[PDB]
Design a protein around this nucleic acid. Structure first.
Ligand SMILES: [Cl-]
Ligand SMILES: [Mg+2]
Ligand SMILES: [Mg+2]
Ligand SMILES: [Mg+2]
Ligand code: NA
Length: 328
DNA sequence: CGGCCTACG
DNA sequence: CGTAG
DNA sequence: GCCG
């Protein structure tokens, strides 16, 4: 009664097993910091199964038969049910390795590999990093200078204001181009740590060269605190107005041709785990190769045309899930 | 045991 | 290496 | 870590 892939079941944003899923997610995150992507995936998948259940797990019996629950994830849940805490989870939470890797990887421009190297060198705090700016990229310098603002949640109210300013620049860059809110806010989140936008134009080909024109215009309006500069994804830090001041916010801008827009919308709406699971399902169960540009049949050597996300779910033999049910 | 999503900057 | 969902 |  519980399918094995997250793309085969609705997952709402709020659910009935929040504490259990959060614990499993700590173990997933810690596995990622050690480079164990397989263990990360299993703990993420097990967490997501609990998000999709219709009521709280109250007894270990209720895990029997659920996919992605083996000895380890079951023991975590058992300890939480019996004692309200899991010793392994709490040991990870208080560990210097976990806390420092979490802090470093949260920096824009720093991934697991950089964070791990800094950890092995003995670095532990952001001020440690600030004291040797020679070992930092321009991107990392920006991420470090803006880290405090970037750690503050972006509210839905902030999103609406940002969308209007992006639409103004996009309209001058290319009249008729459109801006669609994606990522977590499209799935119904009330907060986030960034804002994701997808830009297209109804006339195929007109979107070529668009993103540099949009970036130049936002830069000229004084709104860009940082960006990496032909391109189609821009990872920016924007100046967002606040009462009597402003704050830095991460904004991602993506361009797609309208022929690819359903695939880009699907990919950029997420969740991350939902999309990994959907691509895994496509390839392993249907023999089709999915990305944010299209869906390829490698036997016929043809690309599926899609005019909607609904088309893509139908192509893959899956019941449609609206964005609010993709919170795997 | 092999596999674990698949891109772009 | 970083980034994204 | 789990699935097939
Ligand atoms: Cl692993
Ligand atoms: Mg986002
Ligand atoms: Mg983003
Ligand atoms: Mg992210
Ligand atoms: Na980072």
């Amino acid at each position: 009664w519980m399918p094995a892939y997250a793309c085969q079941r609705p997952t709402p944003l709020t659910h009935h097993n929040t504490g259990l899923s959060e614990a499993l997610e700590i173990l997933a995150e810690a596995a990622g910091f050690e480079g164990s992507e397989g263990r990360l995936l299993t703990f993420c998948r097990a967490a997501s199964v609990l998000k999709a259940l219709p009521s709280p797990v109250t007894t270990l019996s209720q895990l029997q038969g659920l996919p992605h629950f083996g000895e380890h994830s079951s023991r975590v849940v058992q300890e939480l049910l019996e004692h309200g805490v899991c010793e392994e989870v709490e040991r990870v939470r208080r560990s210097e390795r976990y806390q420092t890797m979490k802090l470093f990887t949260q920096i824009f421009g720093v991934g697991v590999k950089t964070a791990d190297r800094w950890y092995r060198e003995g670095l532990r705090t952001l001020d440690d990093l600030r004291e040797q700016p020679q070992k930092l990229t321009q991107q990392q310098k920006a991420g470090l200078q803006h880290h405090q603002d970037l750690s503050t949640p972006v509210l839905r109210s902030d999103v609406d204001a940002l969308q209007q300013v992006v639409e103004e620049a996009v309209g001058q860059a290319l009249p008729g181009a459109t801006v669609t809110l994606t990522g977590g806010f499209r799935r119904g989140k009330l907060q986030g740590h960034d804002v994701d936008f997808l830009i297209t134009h109804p006339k195929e080909g007109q979107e070529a060269g668009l993103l540099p024109r949009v970036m130049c215009r936002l830069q000229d309006q004084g709104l860009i605190l940082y960006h990496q500069h032909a391109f189609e994804r821009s990872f920016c830090i924007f100046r967002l107005p606040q009462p009597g001041s402003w704050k830095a916010v991460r904004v991602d801008l993506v361009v797609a041709p309208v022929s690819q827009f359903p695939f880009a919308l699907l990919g950029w709406t997420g969740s991350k785990l939902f999309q990994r699971e959907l691509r895994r399902f496509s390839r392993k169960e249907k023999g089709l190769w999915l990305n944010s540009h299209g869906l390829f049949d490698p036997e016929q050597k043809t690309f599926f045309q899609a005019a909607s996300e609904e088309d893509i779910f139908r192509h893959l033999g899956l019941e449609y899930l609206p964005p609010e049910q993709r919170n795997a």
